[PDB]
């Protein structure tokens, strides 16, 4: 590549691998937020903070995918892993299945940000922490706040609904 | 009639029978409405979504009787029965019992189309998909949801009173 | 489920195969859209083509999915395949790909129709016309357009250049 | 200096050396401008494309200087060497020259990057990351872009002005 300077196969490859985390952490929201419109489920609020979600981790990928031609890495696409249950159980359930989602997304930035920082690539490193690594915290603040909420209202119907309607 | 090209008399005679089930269904509409403003019930949010709904199913009985002349079909009108219930119970029964209004509503839609389909009416079959199918479909979702919000709040009283406040 | 009518197991399979047959072509557009970010590409007016159809093919499917809980059917996901191709060569091969690939998606959508139409589904059978049969037509009729253009213009080099630039 | 903290020797030395390394890309770049200005080269977009980077890489050395002093460093100047060239051939040479200037210049950022890092000065590191990095990345992607389009048009003569017509 005449453009590549200071991008090692490493960083390259890892930086595919976290785009497929992405699109399969939208694709676990984009099923959350289907699952919160069922006529038998209806937590309209539950559902757009999910499809929301799903849209920030897909932006998410598309921007590591311009990252990776801006160095002059080449994108490599893999199957997307379907989400990996079929129905989500109670707001406390999805929620608590959210953060376990983000809690690994978080990791592998982190890990991303050390191999950058071990193979002395300042760009990359940069890039994180300038569109991921904040945003994961917050994101994850704000989730353990709602899990905090959701279990001091567990009446767990009237609970859960007084949550998607005060908070969501 | 100077006009009537591809009408059949069956098809016709359906859309009177329909004309009549619609002005029925706003007439169930409206006791329902005015029951829930009773001062012993006094649910004012449910009293506005029955009133609403005996309106939407007077303008669909108008829409009918005017594709009716379009057509060069002949309007004729029957006895409208009073409604099923004097009292309607709490905002769960009402809410069941408009579930079943509607899906009565939509099998005869349904029943309509069919006949036209075999009769050859591509007019009638348009007019029913672009006018009623797909607000009866949206309206039996809503009800559903509304269904299952109520399912989940019932201290019987104050879930329905936080269901009218918050929901309707 | 309380809102289920008229929705037959058939149709309800089939609305999920849609779904991931959409939601693949999104992301073989994704893939098409970035290659031609490219350094060694760099053919900026064929990018945006091409993300822009990721974003129309992603909306199909949630469009599929909102109709497939209006109705009472249960969403269920499967994994999405990797495009078929890592690299897509000149926007002529990129072109011919795309107009398979939409093909086999209204091929997709006739067949769901006919299933509809046998199932006597005709809220389905208007669903599908009103959102899908029209777009796909109009979009086919762009893409063959556009390799006509193409294929009038391949000095190879040359003729790529000027319909990236005068074209899209 | 009575502000000077953690800012060494050997930092501020490399600072005046990338000074002077920005002033001479500036210099660079103020001849290629003039060059394509000539009437017997006369491509307009490709003088002014070059002109303005000669602005950028003006401003790069002032912000670099202005750092200097708000660290307590010293700026010391010396001589600017005059560009290597004093014709530059045709845009595509120009466009060649241009990314290999560009290159050592981020060269010489990640090399300060990686001394202040060894010095433990993370201001340093940060001013490079936020004002350097990313502009340098950004700018070598868009070069090597206008690199791969002009070689996709070279009927030499007729390539080079549709490139400074219809992308400059
Ligand atoms: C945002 C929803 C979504 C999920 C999974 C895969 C894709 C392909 C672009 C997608 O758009
Ligand atoms: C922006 C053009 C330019 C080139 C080289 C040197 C100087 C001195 C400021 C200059 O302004």
Not at 48 to 72: D, I, P, T, V, Y
Not at 73 to 78: E, N, P
Not at 140 to 162: F, P, S, W
Request: hydrophobic letters at 40%; proline letters at 1%; one cysteine or more.
């Amino acid at each position: 590549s005449q453009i590549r300077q200071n991008y090692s196969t490493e960083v390259e490859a890892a930086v595919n691998r976290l785009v497929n985390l992405y699109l399969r952490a939208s694709y676990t929201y984009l099923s959350l937020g289907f699952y919160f419109d069922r006529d038998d489920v209806a937590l309209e609020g539950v559902c757009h903070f999910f499809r929301e979600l799903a849209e920030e981790k897909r932006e998410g990928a598309e921007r590591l995918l311009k990252m990776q031609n801006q160095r002059g890495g080449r994108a490599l696409f893999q199957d997307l892993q379907k989400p990996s249950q079929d129905e989500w159980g109670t707001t406390l359930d999805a929620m608590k299945a959210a953060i376990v989602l983000e809690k690994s997304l978080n990791q592998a930035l982190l890990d991303l940000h050390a191999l950058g920082s071990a193979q002395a690539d300042p760009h990359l490193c940069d890039f994180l922490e300038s569109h991921f690594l904040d945003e994961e915290v917050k994101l994850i603040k704000k989730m353990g706040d709602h899990l905090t909420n959701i279990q001091r209202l567990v009446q767990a119907g009237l609970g859960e609904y007084l949550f998607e309607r005060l908070t969501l």
